[PDB]
Symmetry: C3
Amino acid sequence: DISTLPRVKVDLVKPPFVHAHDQVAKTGPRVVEFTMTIEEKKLVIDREGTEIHAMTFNGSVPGPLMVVHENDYVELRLINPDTNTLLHNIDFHAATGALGGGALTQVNPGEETTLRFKATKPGVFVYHCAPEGMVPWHVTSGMNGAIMVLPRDGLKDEKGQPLTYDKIYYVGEQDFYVPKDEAGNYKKYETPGEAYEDAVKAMRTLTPTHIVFNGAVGALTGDHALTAAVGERVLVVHSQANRDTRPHLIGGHGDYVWATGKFRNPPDLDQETWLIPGGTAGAAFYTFRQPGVYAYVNHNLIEAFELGAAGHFKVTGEWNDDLMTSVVKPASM
Amino acid sequence: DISTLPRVKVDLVKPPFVHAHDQVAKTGPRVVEFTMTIEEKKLVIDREGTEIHAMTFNGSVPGPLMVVHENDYVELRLINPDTNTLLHNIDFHAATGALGGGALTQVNPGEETTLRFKATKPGVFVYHCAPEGMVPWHVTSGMNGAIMVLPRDGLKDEKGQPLTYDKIYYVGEQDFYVPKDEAGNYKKYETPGEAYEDAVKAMRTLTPTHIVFNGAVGALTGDHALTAAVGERVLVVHSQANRDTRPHLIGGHGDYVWATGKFRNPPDLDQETWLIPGGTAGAAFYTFRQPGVYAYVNHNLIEAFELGAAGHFKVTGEWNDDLMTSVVKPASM
Amino acid sequence: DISTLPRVKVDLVKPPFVHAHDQVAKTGPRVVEFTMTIEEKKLVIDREGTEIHAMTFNGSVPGPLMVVHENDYVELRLINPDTNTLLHNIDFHAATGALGGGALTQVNPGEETTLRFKATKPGVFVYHCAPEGMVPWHVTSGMNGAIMVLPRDGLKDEKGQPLTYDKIYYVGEQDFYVPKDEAGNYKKYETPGEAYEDAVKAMRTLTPTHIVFNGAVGALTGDHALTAAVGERVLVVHSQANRDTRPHLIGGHGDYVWATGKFRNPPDLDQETWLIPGGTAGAAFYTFRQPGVYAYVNHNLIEAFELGAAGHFKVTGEWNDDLMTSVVKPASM
Ligand SMILES: [Cu+2]
Ligand SMILES: [Cu+2]
Ligand SMILES: [Cu+2]
Ligand SMILES: [Cu+2]
Ligand SMILES: [Cu+2]
Ligand SMILES: [Cu+2]
């Protein structure tokens, strides 16, 4: 049976970008093959030069977004090169059995493995490393991403009418817990293992030191802001593998939102802000109507503006005065 | 076009009360005009006399609830008198473009401005101050309120049948982060600017020192409890601009609840408790069936009973023994 | 009227197990009688021997799950024996009036009382102790449980088709706040009253020291794991009386989930993780398709793996290679 199915290999891209795919399936079920390489590396996460030992899927935080269709088979080749120091694995919330695949994918440095699972449920799911005994440490070190399982006939609104996006971006939100000394300065370590003991004490406080989008404070700002034009329909996938978040598009809305990200449920309409539970991926669809800069944020404003959970969208087009206008510009009373 | 529309001026009232309005629109689209004055002031928030420098819209925490209908135009005149010390602005989650209006409304002390926006989506939304670089500080100092955009034909249940409330109250929940000395006593400052540096460190802990309804511990209790009678349908609008909350009416339920507050979605039925994400306003409708005192609370009971998130409802009418009755009054075994 | 109704007495069982009942009602409305005895006792909650003074309903944390049908009358006899030291009461979120029954059930040691209330709304609700002035202290000491009010015709899916479970388990999640000394070691006390003052300071930090299922770290693991077989439909009721949680079944899904637990609402489909607000009970239905061990967890992985919020399910049956298979077992590159 599987023997007889067609197979296509897909090369992943760096977040916030997503690999090429079809919204509405043009072929029947296939075996979609992906390859990911584990990369343990130093990453500076803020302006002051704070550095951490990140554990990544393909060198990025978050790992890349995989896109398949309902009932396709996902075949993943996972490589943990000998240059790494730790054992890793992968658990797909999209999969059924063996701890999402975690129990079948344990690889020490120098090993690789190939897992296959059937994508039976449509929606966006989280995938993350989960080694027995060090689960939270690997997850909060940036070792998580997401996979989107699109219905074979694309997305639909609450009335069952088609929703087609022109652009899609993937925003992975990460909570970090950097160990501190007595005065409050962040610690620095030589290898991941040296950090271990302190990492555990830092996590138990339940208070992140940083909460960032795409691995660093300011990662999606300035020259890296997400782009769009007035009239374009944009799908924004957002994941949080360990902690709750509440996305909000400043100056806009989530016209159609699947906060818990499962496509067999009708979406929520006109959301100002929505709650994505830790350990979940959600998706919001919106059509831009005004040009300018928009701030995309986690709406606990301290987490957004003090801790790093903020990104930008710079949109082009003509301003619509019917929607909004300054009647009297700021001036002396 | 707008030139030709009728205009009505509306005078706002102090929360928990709401200005007069029609549920079902009796006229066509209008330009609804409001005026708000910014007031920086000292406020004692608890029993022990803890004082803070509140930044308010119209002198209250939360700012007043504005009520309009879908497709009306909201025209707001914002005044920042010369007696204030800081720059402020306003961002409406209900609006489209320019950061909800934040980028078009920056006024220094002594200035005013007039913004107009079209209310295209029905529901309850949050509005708040959001000056570049000091967003969380202004929001957590009480500078936020809400606006309700009612469908032109009023509220409806999941089956599309009309829901008419007899009373409406607005509950604004506020998380405060008062700076403390080494022993844990709260600090006091002369002006808002003197507090700034410490405020930022207090917020980063992510742990509020107080969480209150209507600006103070006990604000909605005793002589200030909300009132109703058995048989009255009450709509309770609740907002939280920065942090999640989970409202609950002790001894009652939320018969119809729009937890994320957007009226084009059918409401959730018979809720015991519901989650309102930080940066959102929600609404719950209930019909009183029993008389007596009810406690309205944020259901993290530590936040409610230790931190200040608790209010009362005292309802009049006849007791119904079919619903509840004490068969054997407390007595010695 | 009530005089004329039939009455059945039901003996409760220890969580995670549930007392015998009918899903679809075979008789008409009845007066269902229950008896609960309050038990103040020492409980060691972790591996290191940390001990607390738990306040329980029937000797367990959580208290037992009561199951009735919509429109039955619940008659509870509550006994607070003279061996206890504190005043207690009970508030049912399922009931209407008198603070859920809290104001009608105050019993000092040596007293008992009998309350009756009509179960007008279907769903799973939380019930908990709530004495004026010490509400959070009694709740966070383990004094809470849940009650399920089933529709007279059983559970249904979003299309109104019947959902019948073969097994049902009750998982009560508890956040504990154990006082610590300067070095971080947990304190020990002789009686509940001796703990009081310190308990209040510990709770105000808003950071639990332990978050457990069924009263202790590891309570639902090893020889106590929940059991099932491939093909069995399992309903898992989960409650959290004070704090938000986000359940997740590792290696599985929530096929039908009522996150806020009210049965008149259609369930959410294919959830990976769902949010249950503090002060609420929810229910998830799932059909096992793969054998093996599954970890049932609160998906903030620090709370799950560091703090104690983790349990197991060991399921029997044949492995399905179509759903999942290891194509290449972990080996040297
Ligand atoms: Cu790993
Ligand atoms: Cu997971
Ligand atoms: Cu301001
Ligand atoms: Cu905002
Ligand atoms: Cu008690
Ligand atoms: Cu309660």
